[PDB]
Amino acid sequence: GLVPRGSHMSGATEACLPAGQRKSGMNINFYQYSLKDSSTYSNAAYMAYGYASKTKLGSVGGQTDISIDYNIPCVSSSGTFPCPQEDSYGNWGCKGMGACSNSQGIAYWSTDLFGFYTTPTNVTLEMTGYFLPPQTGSYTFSFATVDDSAILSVGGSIAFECCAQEQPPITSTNFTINGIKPWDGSLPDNITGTVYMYAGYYYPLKVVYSNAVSWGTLPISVELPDGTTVSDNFEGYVYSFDDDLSQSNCTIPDPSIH
Ligand SMILES: [Cl-]
Ligand SMILES: [Cl-]
Ligand SMILES: [Gd]
Ligand SMILES: [Gd]
Ligand SMILES: [Gd]
Ligand SMILES: [Gd]
Ligand SMILES: [Gd]
Ligand SMILES: [Gd]
Ligand SMILES: [Gd]
Ligand SMILES: [Gd]
Ligand SMILES: [Gd]
Numbered sequence: 001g002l003v004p005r006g007s008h009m010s011g012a013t014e015a016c017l018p019a020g021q022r023k024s025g026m027n028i029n030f031y032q033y034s035l036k037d038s039s040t041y042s043n044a045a046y047m048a049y050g051y052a053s054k055t056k057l058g059s060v061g062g063q064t065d066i067s068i069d070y071n072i073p074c075v076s077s078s079g080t081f082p083c084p085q086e087d088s089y090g091n092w093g094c095k096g097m098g099a100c101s102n103s104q105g106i107a108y109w110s111t112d113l114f115g116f117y118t119t120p121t122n123v124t125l126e127m128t129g130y131f132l133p134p135q136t137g138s139y140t141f142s143f144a145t146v147d148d149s150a151i152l153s154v155g156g157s158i159a160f161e162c163c164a165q166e167q168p169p170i171t172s173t174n175f176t177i178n179g180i181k182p183w184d185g186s187l188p189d190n191i192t193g194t195v196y197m198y199a200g201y202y203y204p205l206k207v208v209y210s211n212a213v214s215w216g217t218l219p220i221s222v223e224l225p226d227g228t229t230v231s232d233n234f235e236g237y238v239y240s241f242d243d244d245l246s247q248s249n250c251t252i253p254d255p256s257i258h
């Protein structure tokens, strides 16, 4: 009577209440990933944590604008311009630019991914932060498409451990969205994963994304309990906290009864 009974079979997603100074945005770490390696990123262990065993290239913090949309250059008669993938044709040209003289299959350097100078043709990145629901209820995260391989995980001990955002990745493969590139071809669009969330709790959020060749795409959305959709720009929803491994009360295993 007096209190709610709590989610059945302790099924609530673990959340956190970090006591430190909140910073807007997610942290992005970048790791080496080999041009044309179409197999490493097809393994769950790699996408959950193995990526951090490869050389770390760099990081940028405070990112609220998180969708990925990387276009290779077309070296054309009029200069070098990024080619939207749907405008690529033949062997090859880019609509409105004529024939492109450069290879689709080499590494290209760009600051497209969050202003960090790297090779978006071949890289793995890890986005970490906390999602703050403004409303209690069911949230549906989605990737509109995945080019090449990606996962999204939400929850304490699933994305990472509360108040330990900056630690080496945890080994959980219980993904909220599994957008891992299948060994055999495959992979529909609008892959989705739902999480029930309680307003005002901070939910660890990890996205791991990888590309082996040319174009890279990962359009990230969330549908709120109120049926509206937030896409690309998660300002106001995603935050970072410096690690505090000594904050004893930081983990809230069951927000339904806290
Ligand atoms: Cl370009
Ligand atoms: Cl053309
Ligand atoms: Gd964007
Ligand atoms: Gd932007
Ligand atoms: Gd972009
Ligand atoms: Gd960009
Ligand atoms: Gd851009
Ligand atoms: Gd952009
Ligand atoms: Gd844990
Ligand atoms: Gd690609
Ligand atoms: Gd809906």
Ligand SMILES: [Gd]
Binding pocket: none
């Ligand atoms: Gd944009």
Ligand SMILES: [Gd]
Binding pocket: 166, 242, 243
């Ligand atoms: Gd730190």
